[PDB]
Structure formats: structure tokens, C-alpha cells
Swiss-Prot record:
Protein name as it appears in the record: CLIP-associating protein 1
Family, per entry: Belongs to the CLASP family.
Signal peptide stretch: none
Cystine pairings recorded for this chain: none
């Protein structure tokens, strides 16, 4: 193609899957080359349009290879733009949140990898998580599970100090009574991980939330197991 923003935008908007598979990597090279893409933030309007095209069209593609490649292009953008990507986070998040529950595990996993990278280079964990809480109520059980997993992954990447956990825990608690057993496991797991990073405070928070006692029993027993194993992180 051409090393120009209108050329790249056009290759992002065009909807031929074969051509997308062919130029995804060229788009990556363009954004990761400061000379070829020196004009990147000259026109904020078509920068916005390009991110938007990736999020709405590539990420939502029915071809999972297009989804993964689109996520990769986004990833190159984050590396190139750093904190200036913060302006784009809101635009990309709904489709990334959805794709935490995609049919393909490879997509769920790269999606998490990208999300973590956005938290690391475009903003911070809490700015992104303030905007992801909607995912807890997503109708696809694989997305609710994905949110809990992504929270675990976040604790390990950045530590509990970077999250306002008191904001997030109520949502997980809601997930404890999920119709889906995998979502319920994932939520219990999330609470166990939080406890590993934070300790007894979580047990107090949880006890004051009017959960059924059956639920409290399962979780607290698991907390006790963590203590027994000296598996605390902190």
C-alpha cells in the first residue's frame, strides 16, 4: 500500500477478509515506524476513525484471524501513542469487553493481553476498570467469566494497590449467584485471589454484604485453605 494515513485508513475500513489478512502486518509496520507514520496524529479525526474502524469492524469480525490481527494492530497503536491512547480507550472498550467472551479461547486470551497493555502504557489499571464494570452484567456467561479472570490477571500484573477493589468486589459478589457454574467458579476464584493479595479485610467486607450463609461458608473455607498453605502474597 501507501505510507499515508488516508491509505491506511482505507485499508482498515475495507471489508475484504483476504486483503485484511494480507495487510494487517503492513498496518502494524506503518504504526511502529516513526518515519513512515510521522503524520499519525496530524488529523485527529481520521486517527479516531481508524481506531474506530479497528474496534467496530476488525475486533467484531466473524473471522477470528481478523479479530486477532485487529487486536495486534490496536496493540501497535498503544505502543506508538502511549498515554495519548487514553483518549481512545472509551472507543475500544465495548468490543474488547465483549470479546472477553468470544467463541475462541485464543481471542479471549489476546484480548486480555491487550487490555493489560492498555492499563500499562495508555493509562492505569483503575482508569480502565472504572470503564469495564459493565462487563459484569453482559448476557454472555463467557464474558462474565472473562471479566473475573481478567481481574485476577490484573492483580498479578499490577498488584492490589492499583485497584479500588471496594468498587469491584460487589460486582463479583453478584456473580456468586450466577446461573452459570463456570461464572460462579470464576467469581469465587476471584475472591480467593483478592484475599491472597489483600488478606482479612476482604473477609470483613464480604461478611457485611448479606450473602447467603452457604456462600459465605464456601468462600471463607477457601480463605482458610489459603492461610493453611502459606499461599498469601501481599
Amino acid at each position: 500500500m501507501e505510507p499515508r494515513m488516508e491509505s491506511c485508513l482505507a485499508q482498515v475500513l475495507q471489508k475484504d477478509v483476504g486483503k485484511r489478512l494480507q495487510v494487517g502486518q503492513e498496518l502494524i509496520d506503518y504504526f511502529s515506524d516513526k518515519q513512515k507514520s510521522a503524520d499519525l496524529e496530524h488529523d485527529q479525526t481520521m486517527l479516531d476513525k481508524l481506531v474506530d474502524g479497528l474496534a467496530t469492524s476488525w475486533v467484531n469480525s466473524s473471522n477470528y484471524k481478523v479479530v486477532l490481527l485487529g487486536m495486534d494492530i490496536l496493540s501497535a497503536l498503544v505502543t506508538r501513542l502511549q498515554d495519548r491512547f487514553k483518549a481512545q480507550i472509551g472507543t475500544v472498550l465495548p468490543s474488547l469487553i465483549d470479546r472477553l467472551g468470544d467463541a475462541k479461547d485464543s481471542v479471549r486470551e489476546q484480548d486480555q493481553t491487550l487490555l493489560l497493555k492498555i492499563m500499562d502504557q495508555a493509562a492505569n489499571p483503575q482508569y480502565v476498570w472504572d470503564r469495564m464494570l459493565g462487563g459484569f452484567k453482559h448476557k454472555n456467561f463467557r464474558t462474565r467469566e472473562g471479566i473475573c479472570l481478567c481481574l485476577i490477571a490484573t492483580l498479578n500484573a499490577s498488584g492490589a494497590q492499583t485497584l479500588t477493589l471496594s468498587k469491584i468486589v460487589p460486582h463479583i459478589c453478584n456473580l456468586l449467584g450466577d446461573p452459570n457454574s463456570q461464572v460462579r467458579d470464576a467469581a469465587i476464584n476471584s475472591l480467593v485471589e483478592i484475599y491472597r493479595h489483600v488478606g482479612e479485610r476482604v473477609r470483613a467486607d464480604l461478611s457485611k454484604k448479606g450473602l447467603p450463609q452457604s456462600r459465605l461458608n464456601v468462600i471463607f473455607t477457601k480463605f482458610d485453605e489459603v492461610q493453611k498453605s502459606g499461599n498469601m502474597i501481599q
